[PDB]
Symmetry: D2
Subunit: 253 residues, 4 copies
């Protein structure tokens, strides 16, 4: 019974935890009584997030992480086990971004930058998360942040679309591999979410994005945080290998 303490005694690693969905998810894990590891490329921004967590009485600690560098990942996971005694839950959330351009004109470097963070980064994240969770070995749960663009395409963002599809596949294979050893792995596909930078777009564009969501609005970070934290929770014990939309019915048409 209950939400307030359902993650008591548990350690949750959240990548890209300094901003947006990552931060909203860090806070949701805290509201559930989890012990939160705030991990981000932005060292001081992770500290700020984790300090704010502690100031609301949540147990949390910051760690500097770059998902593109396997050893930075391994260290972050080591920090989590070091700091809170185990690794139980993970939210692979770090991600960019990428410029908009047709495939034929797309910058090669931009492509690699996108794929390296969005796809490879998630692979590296799981690569070290899984042993630490398995060795524990009280089972566990991982959620990979994909996107609607992990299941449909988007004109002008081929790298991003590629990567995000890749996260979906990464999720299925891994879940097929681990479900029986009591580690659930799932992915979420959020639609376009309200953010400070998206709220700088001009009226024409923002409206365009909005009309693509039959819901009639963009999503909020919190709203993605709820889906993620559910799939992480014991209530979703038979949810494995699956990809869960939170897109205001963007992909239903």
């Amino acid at each position: 019974t209950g939400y307030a303490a359902e993650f008591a005694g548990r350690t949750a690693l959240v990548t890209g935890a300094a901003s947006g969905i990552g931060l909203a998810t860090a806070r949701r894990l805290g509201a559930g009584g989890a012990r939160v590891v705030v991990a981000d490329f932005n060292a001081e921004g992770a500290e700020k997030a984790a300090a704010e967590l502690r100031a609301g009485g949540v147990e949390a600690a910051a760690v500097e992480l770059d998902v593109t560098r396997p050893e930075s990942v391994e260290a972050a996971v080591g920090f989590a086990v070091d700091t809170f005694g185990s690794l139980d839950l993970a939210v692979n959330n770090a991600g960019i971004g990428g410029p908009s351009a047709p495939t034929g004109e797309y910058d090669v470097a931009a492509y690699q930058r996108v794929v390296r963070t969005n796809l490879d980064g998630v692979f590296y994240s799981m690569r070290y998360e899984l042993p630490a969770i398995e060795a524990a070995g009280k089972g566990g749960s991982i959620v990979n942040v994909a996107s609607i663009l992990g299941s449909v395409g988007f004109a002008g963002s081929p790298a991003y679309v590629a990567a995000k599809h890749g996260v979906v596949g990464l999720t299925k294979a891994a879940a097929a591999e681990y479900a029986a050893r009591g580690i659930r792995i799932n992915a979420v596909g959020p639609g376009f979410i309200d953010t400070p930078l998206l709220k700088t777009m001009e009226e024409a564009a923002y409206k365009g994005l909005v009309a693509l969501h039959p819901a009639g609005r963009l999503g909020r970070s919190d709203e993605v945080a709820e889906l993620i934290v559910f799939l992480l929770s014991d209530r979703a014990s038979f949810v494995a290998g699956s990809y869960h939309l939170v897109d205001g019915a963007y992909t239903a048409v």
Copy 2:
């Protein structure tokens, strides 16, 4: 505030109608809403099974009432909905869980009347449920949420069960179109895709047959009704405020491979 409100009062005030709620996924789902403080309408084709569920909910201190329902009959569906509104004063959440069933045989040999019985209960029934649910929800109008219980067999096929498979794909269909109509009217509409669920009756079957089913699920076991209900009730909740028009698996990673 979701964390201020908590678990036991999450659904306080809200009226929830659940079809097929005398057993299996429906009963578990009825129980999970009640535990969250919902007012519960137990609807079933087994009228006695309904009353039993409602009564035992009431002893557990849940507000609940039973109603006889046959989803194949639009008139029965309408009356059941009217029963919920008449009994608790609104309709806010609904779970179209009623279904069967059907014989196993290849398409070339599949009994025609059996095909009819399966599609009308499984597909038509869900469309009727929604047909009368939506206006009841819309009129009030505080928005609301509807979950349709399809199946893994709504996204993949299964040899020997083409009527069942087709109806369940149909349910995914209903959910998408309906959700695109109503998402901007505050009514969110979703489906769940349970894998094979440890229903009581499929332990009577072969040692082998069971195991064959289990080997189809990477998680290495079959599901429990309570586990589906957990997903159903999250979709119904305000926490899933941006979830609409989508199909959500609760399987063994069945469909992952």
Copy 3:
């Protein structure tokens, strides 16, 4: 080997063959040398189609069909086997329809008509086609005509979307059963097809849903259908093939 004699000696039943996609599939089956049964609710339209094929040197014969009635589907299959000796191939194309309304106010009898023709019709089609193809018994191939609306929804059309999703489902389950017996069963998902004089901007509205920037043609769907029917697609089964100008890719 050749294209004009690709379906030489094989018999093919096409439902709803008097008009649109069914008709174009019939013509494309004919040009490949197939024997063709033109089955359709509109008996006169079927005969007119059968006649045109015969003018082209194509063995073809008309038969009156209501996919809604199981006994009628059975007879249609019987007519195939009696006329040309065998049943090898089938395209389940007969379908409507459905007026528009939000799900909460949708016309119940209209939901009934739509499901019965589009979904039940396809099931009844396969129910009688398969034993005939099987008993032949050198195997065969069936394509069911679904839609983009077999994989995505469309506001205002719950019944149609439901029925077309059913068709995809019926396709996967049947194909699982019969794959090993040498009978391949697939589905196609056309986008909107030029079938005209709508509200000018309503058509443009429909066109804007297709990144290809135009609607599809009947013949275009038929090419995919006939490919899937052919021995070229010998390892294609249980799959749903889009012909939609990228409608569902976004």
Copy 4:
């Protein structure tokens, strides 16, 4: 309207064309009358394939290609354009491979190897084919070779699954981008193909309702259909050629 001349006066680039599906695709494009640029990391293999097609009355030319290197991909595209004047069609088939391990134990270098070839390789290919096909003004067609594992998972092959997923991805976004300008971009999803082990082979087969494995010719036929004008309203879509493998 002429099987043997379906692609007459059209230039087709095929990656991984020295073996298996790419080789069979090349032969099928040739039998259809197309000019065929055989591209491979195996220079000698590519050359033995072009030579064989040439002996068959097919205009063909081989080029060395490493799809992980964007510069090597550009050079192949330019080589096709120079040799045959323009480029109209492309099959992006070069792929491996990859060791078998669970995700938590997977080799970091190998994951990269697999992703670099199978995903990045397809993007680099497209990145250079598109402006070339655009140049010819005539609007062509591109098919990418994904897999059943482009849409479903498979224990032990995380890198591969991810990459094949990214292919389907690239296909959708690129096709959305280019359909209006008259270039259709699609993907194929082959099941397991006979191209070894004990009765693990028997295990594979049992995963396909069809009751056998696929043949590289069977894949080729679907690919070439998609490239053809007969598939003129087919774009942005993923086409399975599996044994009903993904259907259950």
